[PDB]
Short mmCIF file of C-alpha atoms in Angstrom, two decimals:
data_model
loop_
_atom_site.label_atom_id
_atom_site.label_comp_id
_atom_site.label_asym_id
_atom_site.label_seq_id
_atom_site.Cartn_x
_atom_site.Cartn_y
_atom_site.Cartn_z
CA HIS A 15 111.31 75.61 -72.72
CA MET A 16 107.93 76.63 -74.16
CA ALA A 17 107.52 77.75 -77.77
CA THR A 18 105.29 80.65 -76.72
CA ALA A 19 107.52 81.66 -73.82
CA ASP A 20 107.69 85.44 -73.39
CA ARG A 21 111.33 86.50 -73.20
CA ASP A 22 110.21 90.00 -72.29
CA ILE A 23 108.28 88.78 -69.25
CA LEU A 24 111.19 86.50 -68.31
CA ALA A 25 113.70 89.32 -68.71
CA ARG A 26 111.63 91.69 -66.61
CA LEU A 27 111.15 88.99 -63.97
CA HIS A 28 114.95 88.78 -63.78
CA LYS A 29 115.12 92.55 -63.38
CA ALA A 30 112.41 92.52 -60.71
CA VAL A 31 114.09 89.80 -58.65
CA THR A 32 117.44 91.58 -58.71
CA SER A 33 115.96 95.05 -58.07
CA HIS A 34 113.71 93.88 -55.23
CA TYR A 35 115.62 90.86 -53.96
CA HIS A 36 115.28 91.71 -50.26
CA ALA A 37 111.54 92.34 -50.36
CA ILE A 38 110.71 89.47 -52.69
CA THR A 39 112.74 87.00 -50.63
CA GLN A 40 110.75 88.05 -47.55
CA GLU A 41 107.45 87.70 -49.40
CA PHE A 42 108.45 84.09 -50.09
CA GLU A 43 109.48 83.62 -46.46
CA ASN A 44 106.14 84.97 -45.23
CA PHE A 45 104.04 82.85 -47.58
CA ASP A 46 106.13 79.84 -46.60
CA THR A 47 104.38 79.52 -43.23
CA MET A 48 105.61 75.95 -42.74
CA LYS A 49 109.12 76.95 -43.77
CA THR A 50 109.49 74.07 -46.24
CA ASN A 51 111.12 76.43 -48.75
CA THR A 52 108.16 76.51 -51.12
CA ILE A 53 105.09 78.65 -51.74
CA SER A 54 101.87 77.99 -53.64
CA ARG A 55 101.30 78.62 -57.33
CA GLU A 56 98.65 81.25 -56.57
CA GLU A 57 100.94 82.96 -54.07
CA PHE A 58 103.68 83.10 -56.69
CA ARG A 59 101.19 84.60 -59.13
CA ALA A 60 100.32 87.25 -56.53
CA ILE A 61 103.98 88.24 -56.38
CA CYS A 62 104.18 88.35 -60.18
CA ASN A 63 101.08 90.58 -60.24
CA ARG A 64 102.84 93.34 -58.31
CA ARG A 65 106.46 92.82 -59.33
CA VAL A 66 106.13 92.25 -63.07
CA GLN A 67 102.58 92.66 -64.35
CA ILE A 68 99.14 91.12 -64.08
CA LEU A 69 99.60 88.08 -66.27
CA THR A 70 96.71 86.56 -68.17
CA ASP A 71 95.89 82.94 -67.33
CA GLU A 72 97.67 81.89 -70.53
CA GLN A 73 100.77 83.95 -69.85
CA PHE A 74 100.94 82.67 -66.28
CA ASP A 75 100.47 79.05 -67.33
CA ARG A 76 103.41 79.37 -69.73
CA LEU A 77 105.56 81.19 -67.17
CA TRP A 78 104.85 78.46 -64.62
CA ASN A 79 106.08 75.88 -67.17
CA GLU A 80 109.51 77.52 -66.84
CA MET A 81 109.57 77.52 -63.03
CA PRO A 82 111.20 75.05 -60.61
CA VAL A 83 108.09 73.26 -59.32
CA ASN A 84 107.93 70.32 -56.91
CA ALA A 85 105.82 67.15 -56.84
CA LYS A 86 103.03 68.98 -55.01
CA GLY A 87 102.84 71.74 -57.61
CA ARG A 88 104.51 74.30 -55.36
CA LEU A 89 107.31 76.71 -56.23
CA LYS A 90 110.79 75.80 -54.99
CA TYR A 91 111.68 79.43 -54.36
CA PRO A 92 115.30 79.09 -53.28
CA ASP A 93 115.93 77.62 -56.74
CA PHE A 94 113.87 80.39 -58.33
CA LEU A 95 115.78 83.13 -56.50
CA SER A 96 119.15 81.67 -57.48
CA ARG A 97 118.18 81.51 -61.15
CA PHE A 98 116.55 84.92 -61.43
CA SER A 99 119.10 86.81 -59.33
#
């Protein structure tokens, strides 16, 4: 969506999700302590830090603009997993 979207970061995020699907899905599960199928923005960034790269605030803000986010500003991870896998 965003004009300054980084297709390289998006492409590598796709690769990361497919290559580490089992582990990443469980990271989501574990952060989702209430099991509402969502995790926090900062928790998602933590996953990005280790699975893709340590994004700058700007890069993360733009990446987040492309994510499936709910009314509370949380990541709808089942939707994320489907798209990036």
